[PDB]
Every structure is written in C-alpha cells, then in structure tokens.
C-alpha cells in the first residue's frame, strides 16, 4: 500500500535551523508593539505557548496526503514516474517567509520547477487555491493551536497569499525582514534573504 503521505523531509541540521528560526519569530512577534495592538483580532501572550502543538521530530513539506490509498488521487500520484524517480532523492527548499495566524504558524516554501513536478493536482482543490499558481500551498508546519490540525497550515497560507495578491506597507522591522499585518490575526515575515533547507523526498508511514 501507499504511504501516509509523500513529502520532503528536512535533515536534522536543516530542521533545527528552521525550527529555531520559527521560535525566535514567535518570541519577536509576541514582543512587538504592532502585534499587541491587534490581540483582540487574535485572541478573545506567549505565542510559543499558544502554538503548543509542534512537530515532535524533523520538519517536513508535504506534497500529497495518501492515507495508504484512502485519499482521493493517491494512487494516481504515486504511479507517476517523476515520483518514483525522485523517491529518495535530495532536494533544496527555499523558505521565503514565516507566518502566523490564530490557528497555525508555518513557513512558506517556494518550489522550483523541478519540485513543482512533484506537486499533485487532484480534482478537489479548496477555494483559496483560485487565482494563485500551483504549489503556492507548499509549506512547513511549525506549530498549531490546541484544537487545530497541521493540515490547516496550508489553508492558512493560501488564505494569506490571496490577500497579498491584491497588492501593502510593512508595520515593523524584524532582524530577518519586514513584518506585515494582513488583518484578522494574520502576520507575515518577508525574509530579506530566503533560507535554504536540505530535504529528502520520500514517503512517511504511520
């Protein structure tokens, strides 16, 4: 049978680098003037505590949830030649931004053309994936609220990218880049220089 999901799994070193950057962002954003004004638009605050649910091991960037072939389009994805050829191969993922919402905290991944070939295109695509290019959903989950599932992180990103498509000015300056307030508890850090993490494409089993 198929794996739980296919994706890029960061090396232990790359995972640690991205994770430590994630927590620093939560600490910074939480201490920031701009954030403390819109708390009512966020909570009815230590964000590291708020996003208590975090990946226990190495971080990953999912491509296709298969659920052992229970998910729609799972078989059609795994039978691809590019998926078989890329299985076990090493890749580099570009991290363009770190973001936060009342539900999730994650990192936006900007996929290369090669890596975009490993991105699925099934019949079911959520509303927020409308006028945006494929792979825009690509991300690494850094944390979630207590009653939120990791899958939500992708939806949060697509919702965020829809906002920026309309454009915005930054409300602050973090050491790694400019901070943008997108309203309704959403925040994005546009990194001055994009982070590169090393990862391996493969399948995860429960």
Describe this structure in words.
It is built from seven helices and eight strands; from the N terminus they run E-H-H-H-E-H-H-E-E-H-E-H-E-E-E. The protein has 206 residues and is α+β, with helices and mostly antiparallel strands. Strands 1, 2, 3, 4, 5, 6, 7 and 8 form an eight-stranded antiparallel β-sheet that branches. It is globular and about 50 Å long. 33% of the residues are buried.
Write a brief caption for the model.
By secondary structure, the protein is of the alpha+beta class. Helices cover 28% and strands 32% of the residues. Strands 1, 2, 3, 4, 5, 6, 7 and 8 form an 8-stranded antiparallel sheet that branches.
Please describe the topology of this protein:
Layout: E1 5-10, H1 12-31, H2 33-37, H3 47-50, E2 60-65, H4 74-78, H5 81-86, E3 90-100, E4 104-110, H6 113-116, E5 139-144, H7 152-165, E6 172-174, E7 177-183, E8 186-204
Antiparallel strand pairs: 1-2, 1-8, 3-4, 3-8, 4-5, 6-7, 7-8
Function: Catalyzes the formation of 2'-nucleotide products from 2',3'-cyclic substrates. May participate in RNA metabolism in the myelinating cell, CNP is the third most abundant protein in central nervous system myelin.
Active site: 60, 139
Subcellular location: Membrane; Melanosome
